[PDB]
Design a protein around this ligand. Structure first.
Ligand code: Z60
Length: 294
C-alpha cells in the first residue's frame, strides 16, 4: 500500500498479516489487514463492503475496504491492546471481577447488535477482542468468515486456534447459527476468570474430547440430533459431566449459571446475547478503567 505508511507489523491475522499504518492524507493511525489468490471473489468484496455500515461502540469499525492493484485490504480503527495480551499481562493478579463483568457485558452487547443485523462472527478469540484505556472492549472481524471461508491454515503456515470452537462445528455441521458466538464468548469468559484457557485442544479431536471430559459426552437426551451430526462417532468415549463448580472457581453462582447457559451443547438451548444481557449476573455491572501498559 502507498496511501499508507506501515509503522509496524502488528501481528498475524486469520486471513493475513496485520499492520499498524498511517493514512497519508489524514494522518490517522489504523489497523490495516492484507487479505491473502486468483482474483478475489466479487461476492466477498460486496459482502464485506456491507460491513462498513455496522456501527456500535463495541464493534471495531471497518473504516474501508480497499481493492486496488488486484489486492484486498481492510482498514479498521486502531485499538491499543488485545485481550490476549491484557490477560497475559494480568496473569499474576488476574483481571478484577468488576472489569471481567464489564467486558463480558459489552461483548454481549456487540454480539446482540451483530446478531440482530444477521451477522455472525464465527471465530471469536482473545486476539480479536480489542480494548482501550477508557474501559471499552470491541469485537473485530465480525462477518468475515461468512464472506470469505475459514481456511485450514494461513499462508504463513501458522497454527489456527481451536480453543473457542463450538462443538457443532467440531462435529462437522456446515450450518452456523448465532449460538457459535455465544459458545466462544463463554470460553473467553471462563478464561478471564480462571486465567487459563478452558478447552486448550491441540487438534480437532483433542478439542472435542476436552469439551466432553468437562461437560460430559453429549447424547440424544441433552442434544437431540447429535448422533446424526456429520463427524459424530458412536465410538466416542463416554465421559461423565463434571461438577460445574470445579470448572470456574471461584466465580459466584450467578456467573456460573450464566456460563452454563452459554455452554449448553444444543445450539438451540444456548442463551442468546440479548437474553444474557438480562441475566442477574449483570445487575451490579459497572464500567471500570483497566490498567493498560502500552
Ligand atoms: C498493539 C495494538 C494493535 N491494535 C489493533 N487494532 C486492531 N483493530 C486490531 C485487529 O483488528 C486485529 C489484529 C489481529 C486480529 Cl485476529 S484482529 S489489532
Amino acid at each position: 500500500m502507498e496511501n499508507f505508511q506501515k509503522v509496524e507489523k502488528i501481528g498475524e491475522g486469520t486471513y493475513g498479516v496485520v499492520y499498524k499504518a498511517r493514512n497519508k492524507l489524514t494522518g490517522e493511525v489504523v489497523a490495516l489487514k492484507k487479505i491473502r489468490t486468483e482474483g478475489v471473489p466479487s461476492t466477498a468484496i460486496r459482502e464485506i463492503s456491507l460491513l462498513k455500515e455496522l456501527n456500535h461502540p463495541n464493534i471495531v469499525k471497518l473504516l474501508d475496504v480497499i481493492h486496488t492493484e488486484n489486492k484486498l485490504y481492510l482498514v479498521f480503527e486502531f485499538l491499543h491492546q488485545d485481550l490476549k495480551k491484557f490477560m497475559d499481562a494480568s496473569a499474576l493478579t488476574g483481571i478484577p471481577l468488576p472489569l471481567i463483568k464489564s467486558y463480558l457485558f459489552q461483548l454481549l452487547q456487540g454480539l446482540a447488535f451483530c446478531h440482530s443485523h444477521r451477522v455472525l462472527h464465527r471465530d471469536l478469540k482473545p486476539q480479536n477482542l480489542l480494548i482501550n484505556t477508557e474501559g471499552a472492549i470491541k469485537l473485530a472481524d465480525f462477518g468475515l468468515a461468512r464472506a470469505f471461508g475459514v481456511p485450514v491454515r494461513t499462508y504463513t503456515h501458522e497454527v489456527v486456534t481451536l480453543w473457542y470452537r463450538a462443538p457443532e462445528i467440531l462435529l462437522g455441521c456446515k450450518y452456523y447459527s448465532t449460538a457459535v458466538d455465544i459458545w466462544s464468548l463463554g470460553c473467553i469468559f471462563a478464561e478471564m476468570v480462571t486465567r487459563r484457557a478452558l478447552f486448550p485442544g491441540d487438534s480437532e479431536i483433542d478439542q472435542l474430547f476436552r469439551i466432553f471430559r468437562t461437560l460430559g459426552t453429549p447424547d440424544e437426551v441433552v442434544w437431540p440430533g447429535v448422533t446424526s451430526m456429520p463427524d459424530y462417532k458412536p465410538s466416542f468415549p463416554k465421559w461423565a459431566r463434571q461438577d460445574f463448580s470445579k470448572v470456574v472457581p471461584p466465580l459466584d453462582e450467578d456467573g456460573r449459571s450464566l456460563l452454563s447457559q452459554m455452554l449448553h451443547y444444543d445450539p438451540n438451548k444456548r442463551i442468546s446475547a440479548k437474553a444474557a444481557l438480562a441475566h442477574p449476573f449483570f445487575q451490579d455491572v459497572t464500567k471500570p478503567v483497566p490498567h493498560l501498559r502500552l
